[PDB]
């Protein structure tokens, strides 16, 4: 038959890919980083505690100036904080309180959100009326909208729970590119620093590197055993770490095309919800379900530190573009800014 | 004195006014009831919404006896259930619509599975979920008027081969209700209210109001520490 022919061809191709990947692993990262000195202990104290949310905080994102925050909570509210003085600069009421993502524009003018209504709302912050209007409502996804990232003030990259990501032009409101190829629900995005590539992790134990220009899945990385909940690029854009639901972070490489490192600890069996590198890429901060965030030495897979100031499950993390602070949102309706 | 400039003090004023508005809006929201509406496909959810004077989440608001209810229908959300049910952790009750005649019907492409078994599988998955350890459930056994014809024609031996009762509506309904309520594994932390409805039953909102009042008073007595 033709179906079995195509399936056997696909299996031969998968075996060829695995053989080519094994032919490049001449050494491991733990064998090359054996003589490098360890990081030591990292004790980071809670500098700020932002209160004002009345329900679970589901996402946050630092402004590009490393001072302003946006944080979305199923109170129905999207609050824009001034993290230096804990002032609430803005408070935006959502039309649908089931928000699961938010994003702050890299210019500071717009703020996106979305959630269990399949609609990405673009709010304009700097209007002449001093108010905060809904600049756009991008619709077209058929599942819950899990993540959201501003490519530019005009283009946005969303990823929804109908096994697809999309690239919207905000000025018109139409999907100019639909990245398909995943089979499970897409849960996280991470744009490259050079903003020409982005990776997406599904509920399929698979992350995919897409080219945002053409709309073709460049590469596919497997290796996890459960759902992938968070991805972040390494600061140079040639590696990325995925946190999965089986209590494991994994550092994959783009040029080597393989999994490089496995961050796991035997006393940790809780799913991971947030991953973010430090500014230099030496630290990997991972938010877990056991109410704390572990800080791993990203080059040795040691566990350099713990951030254990929260009372409920830790939602999205954030590291400033200056690398000065680490903001942590959680389900106990508090943000905590560590340093 | 406080080293803040004029604009800093005015920014703190704006922050405090935003805090006041947030507190007032949260107080307005906390006085509302949030009912999560669940059930198998074509169990009669839409019939229930039509009876109670009313893509993504379909959110329906209605007031009754100076109590505002917000009913969240999530049957349109076709994705992994375990990826978004945890955002409904703080609802006051889970209405669960189960069709009664559906014990002798099959819906999906899987023709070998009787859809009442799938319905109570879904009930067992929702009731024993780790996010709803203390969220009360309000059963609604729908279309009891059409149940009697199927009782006369086809007994429960099709759906329950271990059936001991006779072909009468009362014993069959009692056995179905018992089989459903015995799927609860958290009988001490959570109550299951059951009600038999039909198309003309206009006492549905009254039963929902009674159950919600019970759950609210029990929650208040739990916050007081008395219960």
């Amino acid at each position, epitope marked *: 038959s033709e179906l079995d022919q195509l399936r056997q061809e696909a299996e031969q191709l998968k075996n060829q890919i695995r053989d080519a990947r094994k032919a490049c692993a001449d050494a491991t990262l733990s064998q090359i980083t054996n003589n490098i000195d360890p990081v030591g202990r990292i004790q980071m104290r809670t500098r700020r505690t932002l209160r004002g949310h009345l329900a679970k905080i589901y996402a946050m994102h630092w402004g590009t100036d490393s001072r302003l925050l946006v944080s979305a909570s199923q109170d129905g509210k999207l609050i824009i904080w001034d993290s230096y003085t804990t002032n609430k600069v803005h408070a935006i009421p959502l039309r649908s309180s089931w928000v699961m993502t938010c994003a702050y524009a890299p210019s500071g003018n717009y703020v996106a959100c979305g959630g269990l209504d399949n609609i990405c709302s673009i709010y304009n912050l700097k209007t002449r*009326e001093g108010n905060v209007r809904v600049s756009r409502e991008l619709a077209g996804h058929t599942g819950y909208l899990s993540c959201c990232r501003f490519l530019d003030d005009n283009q946005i990259v969303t990823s929804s729970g109908d096994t697809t990501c999309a690239l919207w032009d905000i000025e018109t409101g139409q999907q100019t590119t639909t990245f398909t190829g995943h089979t499970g629900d897409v849960m996280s995005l991470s744009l490259a620093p050079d903003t020409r590539l982005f990776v997406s992790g599904a509920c399929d134990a698979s992350a995919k590197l897409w080219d945002v220009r053409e709309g073709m899945c460049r590469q596919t990385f497997t290796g996890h055993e459960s759902d992938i909940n968070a991805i972040c690029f390494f600061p140079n854009g040639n590696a990325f770490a995925t946190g999965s639901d089986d209590a494991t972070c994994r550092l994959f490489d783009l040029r080597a095309d393989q999994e490089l490192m496995t961050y796991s600890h035997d006393n940790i069996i809780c799913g991971i919800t947030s991953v973010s590198f430090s500014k230099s890429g030496r630290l990997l901060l991972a938010g877990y379900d056991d109410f704390n965030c572990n800080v791993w030495d990203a080059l040795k897979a040691d566990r350099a530190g713990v951030l254990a100031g929260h009372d409920n499950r830790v939602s999205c993390l954030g590291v400033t573009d200056d690398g000065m602070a680490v903001a942590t949102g959680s389900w106990d309706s508090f943000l905590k800014i560590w340093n | 004195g406080c080293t803040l*400039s004029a604009e800093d003090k005015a920014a703190v004023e704006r922050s405090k006014m935003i805090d006041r508005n947030l507190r007032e809006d949260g107080e307005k929201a906390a006085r509302e009831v949030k009912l999560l509406l669940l059930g198998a496909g074509e169990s009669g959810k839409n019939t229930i919404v039509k009876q109670m004077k009313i893509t993504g989440i379909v959110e329906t608001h209605f007031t009754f006896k100076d109590l505002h209810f917000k009913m969240f229908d999530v049957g349109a959300q076709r994705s992994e259930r375990k990826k978004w049910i945890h955002c409904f952790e703080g609802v006051t009750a889970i209405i669960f619509c189960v069709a009664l005649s559906d014990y002798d019907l099959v819906l999906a492409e899987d023709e070998e599975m009787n859809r009442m078994h799938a319905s109570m599988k879904l009930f067992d998955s929702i009731c024993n979920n780790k996010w709803f350890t203390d969220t009360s459930i309000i059963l609604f056994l729908n279309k009891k008027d059409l149940f009697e014809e199927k009782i006369k024609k086809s007994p429960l031996t099709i759906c329950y081969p271990e059936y001991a009762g006779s072909n009468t509506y009362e014993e069959a309904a009692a056995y179905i209700q018992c089989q459903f309520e015995d799927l609860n594994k958290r009988k001490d932390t959570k109550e299951i209210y059951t009600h038999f409805t039909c198309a003309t039953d206009t006492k549905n909102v009254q039963f929902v109001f009674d159950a919600v009042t019970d759950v609210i008073i029990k929650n208040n007595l739990k916050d007081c520490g008395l219960f």
Partner: single-chain antibody
Amino acid sequence: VQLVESGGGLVQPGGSRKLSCSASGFAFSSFGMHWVRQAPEKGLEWVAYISSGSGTIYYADTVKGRFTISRDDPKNTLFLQMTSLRSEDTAMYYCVRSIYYYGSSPFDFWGQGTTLTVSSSDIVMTQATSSVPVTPGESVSISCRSSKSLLHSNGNTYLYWFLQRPGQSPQLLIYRMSNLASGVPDRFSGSGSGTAFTLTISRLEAEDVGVYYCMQHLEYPLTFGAGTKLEL
């Protein structure tokens, strides 16, 4: 965005009046509002301030006790109730919008102003000259010297540059000594430090002629300057 004042006219000394500033086209309930008067020739002087809700109310020491601000949010209206007018209050009064948060642009919109004629420590800011001649196309530089160091400890300097065209309300040009206001062409630039500030303009036009004022926002009362005038 529109602010229209009303209630001017001729008043006998010692009388009373009530100026009303009707706002239309913005979220009036969230903006702090100011009344700023201008004598027939002397330049701008700050009068009074009302907060975002009805919070802190400040007054210039020369009008403390005689004037009072009311604010009606549901009708979008500002009120300056004056009692016991003197011959020093004959002036054109401007209603001024200003919102304060991080990165905000206060004093950004000025009403058209109403004329009130009456029948018959502090940060002093000095502008160097009263008039300098210009030709359209050459760069110019205006100076403003404060008496106190406007550089606050949190990093901000709080000097504002306004321009008043002949026969119009003064618009905002530069806020906090560096930042341009939205809608201002990038010919104006601000610089300086401590107690010395400069506004450098690139190639001039026929619409850049006017009077340039500097102001300090450290502490109330906000003290304007003399007003450097340009002539073609």
